[PDB]
Amino acid sequence: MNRPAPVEISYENMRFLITHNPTNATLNKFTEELKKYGVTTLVRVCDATYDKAPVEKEGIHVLDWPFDDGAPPPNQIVDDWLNLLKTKFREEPGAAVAVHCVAGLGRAPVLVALALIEAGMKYEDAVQFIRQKRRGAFNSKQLLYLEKYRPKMRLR
């Protein structure tokens, strides 16, 4: 309930939403959030609280890719993440992709940040852009992941 509002991040004509986990009790406002921002796509990177299917019936592709609380993305999940962005900005140009962990303050930001770096933001700018409008975003591991990350620029 503290869990901070959906944040639009647009960079280099592509668009992101960082969000929180909803509950099913909250859920239709959360889905109304998504289509107001015009997402085609939701990535869950935490465990599942809520039925995806009310969100999926509204015509958002919902993907469950959990990994560990406070981890770097394991190499599969980043691999599939960048492939998903290519296919979905094929699908609608200038749609958004939603990510959430628990609140979006953590491993959902990391996937967005790492997508910014691959699209050629520099890494310090990518962190500060997220942390500007989502306060206290990354932890020590995930900052160190984002530092040690190298692009070979694999979007378009």
Binding site: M1, P4, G70, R135, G136, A137
Partner: protein, 149 residues
């Protein structure tokens, strides 16, 4: 007296919400599954708070506020639980960060936001994702007390 008071308003731009909050254990707080019988209602009356936090399960999970005007036509006999009364009224939750200076919060109370503010800080330490950690509460009343003592 007045010279202490002047210093009080000068303090308002250095002194943070963290300096002056009540920690969450010491706060007057109501469970959602609290039922508003005679005993609970009188406890609310006797508390001397017009705005009371409502929590589910744990205290650090604050869900709604109860205002006193919400208690308007509760029969205390037929035993209305708090959670349904919180569903009757929208009272939007006012969250503040711990490092917010007191003049910014004083203006935030003035801007129309809730005269209860609830206090969070960013939490890196510990292995998980960063989360906002509930520290406790600060009121309009708390900030006035910084001036008038």
């Amino acid at each position: 007296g007045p010279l202490n008071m002047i210093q009080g308003v000068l303090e308002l731009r250095c002194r943070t919400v963290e300096d002056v909050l009540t920690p969450l254990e010491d706060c007057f707080m109501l469970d959602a599954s609290t039922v508003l019988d005679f005993g609970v209602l009188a406890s609310i009356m006797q508390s001397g708070h017009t705005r009371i936090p409502v929590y589910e399960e744990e205290r650090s999970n604050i869900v709604d506020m109860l205002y006193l005007k919400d208690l308007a036509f509760v029969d205390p006999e037929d035993c209305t639980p708090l959670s349904t009364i919180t569903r009757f009224y929208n009272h939007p939750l006012h969250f503040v960060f711990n490092d917010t200076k007191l003049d910014a919060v004083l203006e935030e109370f003035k801007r129309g936001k809730s005269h209860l503010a609830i206090v969070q800080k960013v939490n890196n330490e510990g292995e998980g994702d960063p989360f906002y950690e509930v520290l406790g509460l600060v009121t309009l009343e708390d900030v006035i007390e910084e001036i008038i003592r």
